[PDB]
Amino acid sequence: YSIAFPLLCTHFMSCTHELCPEERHHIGDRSLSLCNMFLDEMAKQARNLITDICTEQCTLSDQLLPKHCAKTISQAVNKEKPGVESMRKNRLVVTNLDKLHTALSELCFSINYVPNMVVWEHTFTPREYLTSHLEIRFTKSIVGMTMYNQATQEIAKPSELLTSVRAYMTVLQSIENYVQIDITRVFNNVLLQQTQHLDSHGEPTITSLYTNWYLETLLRQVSNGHIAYFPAMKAFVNLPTENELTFNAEEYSDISEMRSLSELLGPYGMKFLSESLMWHISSQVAELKKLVVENVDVLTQMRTSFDKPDQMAALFKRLSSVDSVLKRMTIIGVILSFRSLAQEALRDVLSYHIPFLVSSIEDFKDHIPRETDMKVAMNVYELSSAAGLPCEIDPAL
Amino acid sequence: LADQIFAYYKVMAGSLLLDKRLRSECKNQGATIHLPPSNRYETLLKQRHVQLLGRSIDLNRLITQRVSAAMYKSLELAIGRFESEDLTSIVELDGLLEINRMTHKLLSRYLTLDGFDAMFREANHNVSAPYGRITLHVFWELNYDFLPNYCYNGSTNRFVRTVLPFSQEFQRDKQPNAQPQYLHGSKALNLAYSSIYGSYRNFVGPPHFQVICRLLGYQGIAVVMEELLKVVKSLLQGTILQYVKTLMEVMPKICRLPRHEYGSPGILEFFHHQLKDIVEYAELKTVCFQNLREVGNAILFCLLIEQSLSLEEVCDLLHAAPFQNILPRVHVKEGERLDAKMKRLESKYAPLHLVPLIERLGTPQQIAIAREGDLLTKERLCCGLSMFEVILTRIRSFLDDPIWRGPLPSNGVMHVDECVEFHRLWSAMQFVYCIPVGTHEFTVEQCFGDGLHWAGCMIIVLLGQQRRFAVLDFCYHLLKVQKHDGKDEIIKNVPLKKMVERIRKFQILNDEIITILDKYLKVRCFQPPIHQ
């Protein structure tokens, strides 16, 4: 019955008299302020209950992760559980979830009681207050559960973030069962905004944080030699060392993690990551060109003497920077391998999401005539790359 | 050679998809899972010039035939294994299917094989039939086990098993048994996956619903919904109708809510005497409650599955935005206008857009296919479309017997004292199961959960008696008087206090359910007196 107060504000104009016209504007302005404040507070309380409910739901879903079954596996080899919390022995016992659920339902009913109200010829729509607050809180929570601390270079694993997002979406749909608001649009705006490198308000997005962490924490350490690429496991694994890094490469570069990352980001996010990786490659290539040109005369002489081994013996001795070129090319290969894993993950994710578009792209790319010009082929490859297909030529590079 | 190749690839896929944190934790404990040593079947697979006795033999063809047969066997075994267990094995089926798909992808690198979708349809008997085996089993499980053996909890949105089952006639098919390779690769991998998926066995929740939506598509949902409607029709028009008819004959013809002067202790004694036939009735808590739970659980399943379908649908549409010129609201600061920034951003992503690229160059057949695919993808069922309203309308149509509403009121307005309406009986039901039970017997929540309350509220709402039920209710009247006076005393071995809090708790639940139903569901003029 909290909607009564804003309704009472509509009566504030009944105490005005035609004899005292000066008072009318001040009383009329006061009515508009109180109504807005009440709706804002009601929305604030609603979203607060949403966060608490979603937090509990995320905690419940966390217990279903595979990492909690290590003890059972060990016991079986050598020689509390979910579902008990939902058992109701009696109704007199009240938990936190039901208490929040009851309060949220009561508040939602009050909000939805009035579709619209008029105060001093101003139409007010309370459900819009809740919708806007939910959008802001959802975006803030998503950016917050990435748990990114620049000082310790730590970020949440994509799989855990995806599970939390799904729990949040499920809760918000349950809210839709109460209020008439549309939630699918809310998901579209929040998720699309986070997909790009910057949101409307101009704040870091999920894609930007993941791109920065991957470049400055995983690939950098691979160059330093602490990590290597494992084609058999299709992931990066920390090497045996006296001192181990805080994070584990295999827990971020695995197929499941990449699929979760693609699901959270989407084609735009992978495209932005792909562009960043190519930019790093271009820097390395430009650096290599300096070493190539500084020995141009020797290389030209060596090109035409492929059949003379005696000359090659002394020509090689005159070369400079022979290890740097290999090291830089190793870094380039590592970067390209990372992109291939991301492209493969995106293709697998998109295969069961938009099969019609993927099938059309595959037919379009496969049957493209070879006699066509390079411009059209580049356009097809760029679209094919956006879909995650393994194009022979990378337009981004 | 074919047998070892298939086993080696299957175990590689299973190990590759296995979680790494669990592997590390197991290794620390002392139960590490040994990795599969690598081999060099690459050269053997590509060989096509096996010269023997002046003959050319294609080893690739023979390996392909053996692998194709093995893949078909594994898919059939996976479906059969699912068919021999409860509905909680859906997660296991999805995981095993993912492993099989990955193995097919790995083998397709060096061999040629039919698409995984075609093989899956072949094993599911869906290529030549509208519906496969998975949907049939889901419908069979819902009718037999899930509905009459699970109690809902709206606080957690989870289903858990009940106690003292009333049905044991499922008699499921025998489990298929084969070599470890056909199911999750090696034996060591099989134990890990079983332990991982063992957490989903004790409950049913959103994860199960979303997997069902993905597997069943749209045909499975529609057929399941129609069958559930038929089941509800049979229950309401049959056993439930008979029970209400019998119960209405043992209810008081006229019941008047006592005045406040009598007091809360005296008002309980009036209700126990007035409704003593219902209380002594035994089959009410064994059959009628069971049937109401069946319909109530079905409605909840229809609601939850619709929510999951929308959630998956919106997620799918999010990934198609780049190819449909669907752009977000980009940040705009002082110095530039929205129109210029949007135009630049659209031009940047122009190559991604598909239709004009095909239109400018491409066969007309490609243009038509792309247009149809784009139309199907963009138009979906979360863009202003719902079906819960239709389900409620159909249920209302099933109720046509006059017993539900009763004869026309003598006063010419509404029934007040008469008990010829269903909401009257539901109030009597509320009274009987709100009595505190003994220590050696279970409660309604422990047995039927919220399904029973959902069914009763839905029936009341569809008959337009929700307001009358709130106004006329024995339990609500007793609660109001108890609050006004505040007295406690044991009446017929029924504590008065604990009763009213129970009434309050059920009042809250009923109000929440009624509000939800009314939201999803979105005169008579009297004449004045005339001078004689």
Side-chain angles (χ1 to χ4, degrees), chain A residues 138-155:
Chain A
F138 194 35
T139 308
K140 159 163 181 298
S141 179
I142 293 159
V143 172
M145 43 197 181
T146 299
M147 298 291 300
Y148 186 54
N149 188 6
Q150 199 269 340
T152 179
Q153 276 194 355
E154 73 173 2
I155 214 165

Side-chain angles (χ1 to χ4, degrees), chain A residues 168-179:
Chain A
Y168 268 72
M169 299 165 92
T170 294
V171 168
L172 284 166
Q173 291 300 320
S174 177
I175 306 295
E176 183 178 2
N177 306 346
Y178 301 99
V179 185

Side-chain angles (χ1 to χ4, degrees), chain B residues 118-358:
Chain B
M119 287 214 282
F120 180 70
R121 291 181 68 81
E122 196 89 7
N124 201 7
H125 297 165
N126 199 4
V127 66
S128 194
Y131 312 105
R133 298 166 64 188
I134 287 157
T135 181
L136 295 174
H137 192 251
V138 166
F139 169 45
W140 190 95
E141 290 279 10
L142 286 175
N143 203 336
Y144 295 93
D145 175 35
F146 174 78
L147 276 171
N149 293 323
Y150 273 93
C151 55
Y152 185 58
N153 188 344
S155 189
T156 62
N157 194 356
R158 275 169 169 199
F159 286 85
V160 298
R161 286 192 75 82
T162 178
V163 292
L164 191 56
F166 304 86
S167 301
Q168 196 61 258
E169 58 262 22
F170 71 97
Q171 188 54 67
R172 262 180 290 271
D173 289 345
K174 186 200 306 186
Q175 197 167 217
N177 199 359
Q179 293 288 344
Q181 63 205 114
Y182 296 107
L183 174 66
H184 302 287
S186 189
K187 179 181 177 75
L189 274 63
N190 274 271
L191 181 73
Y193 275 109
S194 290
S195 299
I196 290 162
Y197 294 124
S199 65
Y200 303 81
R201 309 293 293 186
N202 289 337
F203 81 93
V204 184
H208 303 76
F209 296 120
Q210 61 177 0
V211 182
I212 289 156
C213 287
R214 289 193 287 103
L215 279 159
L216 274 59
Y218 284 136
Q219 286 266 24
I221 299 290
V223 65
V224 163
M225 291 292 206
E226 292 289 327
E227 292 290 321
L228 295 174
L229 278 168
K230 286 189 276 180
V231 165
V232 169
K233 183 201 183 96
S234 177
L235 277 161
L236 288 164
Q237 296 197 336
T239 187
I240 303 177
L241 184 61
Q242 297 298 309
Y243 274 109
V244 59
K245 280 170 136 163
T246 308
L247 285 156
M248 211 79 78
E249 294 293 332
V250 309
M251 289 172 73
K253 287 281 187 289
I254 61 171
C255 194
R256 275 185 202 85
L257 292 165
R259 289 176 67 182
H260 280 241
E261 303 315 300
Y262 297 100
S264 65
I267 291 170
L268 181 55
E269 192 164 317
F270 164 95
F271 290 134
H272 276 296
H273 158 77
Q274 284 275 110
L275 310 173
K276 199 185 182 298
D277 296 353
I278 301 286
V279 174
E280 297 294 327
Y281 199 79
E283 294 177 352
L284 179 62
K285 304 184 282 294
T286 59
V287 189
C288 194
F289 278 24
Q290 199 84 355
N291 306 127
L292 295 163
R293 193 263 305 285
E294 293 177 350
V295 294
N297 281 9
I299 302 301
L300 283 160
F301 174 83
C302 295
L303 188 71
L304 297 187
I305 196 79
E306 183 178 2
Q307 281 163 219
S308 291
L309 187 77
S310 178
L311 177 61
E312 63 185 342
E313 176 176 321
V314 61
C315 295
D316 184 1
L317 273 168
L318 182 73
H319 284 252
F323 312 97
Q324 307 281 51
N325 199 13
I326 302 298
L327 286 74
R329 181 179 180 274
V330 70
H331 172 40
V332 57
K333 63 187 96 174
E334 59 270 19
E336 183 65 13
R337 298 288 187 277
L338 188 137
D339 289 345
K341 194 166 271 167
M342 287 292 174
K343 301 301 290 187
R344 185 171 66 254
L345 186 63
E346 192 274 328
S347 164
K348 180 165 91 84
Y349 290 127
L352 271 58
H353 206 260
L354 186 69
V355 182
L357 176 56
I358 305 286

Side-chain angles (χ1 to χ4, degrees), chain A residues 191-236:
Chain A
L191 302 172
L192 288 170
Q193 280 191 338
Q194 292 296 284
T195 295
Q196 295 295 100
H197 72 101
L198 282 174
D199 63 348
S200 86
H201 295 83
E203 297 278 48
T205 52
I206 61 171
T207 185
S208 81
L209 305 184
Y210 280 143
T211 295
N212 289 337
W213 193 91
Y214 281 134
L215 268 285
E216 272 72 359
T217 312
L218 193 68
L219 301 171
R220 193 168 57 75
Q221 291 289 355
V222 167
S223 302
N224 292 359
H226 290 159
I227 301 162
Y229 172 55
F230 281 42
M233 293 169 39
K234 284 190 186 296
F236 286 74

